[PDB]
Amino acid sequence: AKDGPRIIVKMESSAGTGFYYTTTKNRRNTQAKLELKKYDPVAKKHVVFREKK
Template identity: 55%
Template sequence: MAKGAREKIRLNSSAGTGHFYTTDKNKRNTPEKMEMKKYDPVVRQHVMYKEGKIK
């Protein structure tokens, strides 16, 4: 059976608060590391979140 193209990832806050979101992405369509601005409730601001591995 074929292996799925989607991989679970963790979006870590660049503010250094330790807050993170989990999501998934299609590795074939977006092979580069994902970065997006999302809300960090610890600092109560929108900050940049960068992709990291789920441990």
């Protein structure tokens, strides 16, 4: 879980309007621009999560 100059990254996470932190390990190597997934926030759950920041 160590960090430094290296490739990949640990990129933070958030939702449309919902407030939640996934914090998953991403990688800039093959492709990273869209960090977009589907994850479930505070109440409504059921949302698309843009982890791009």
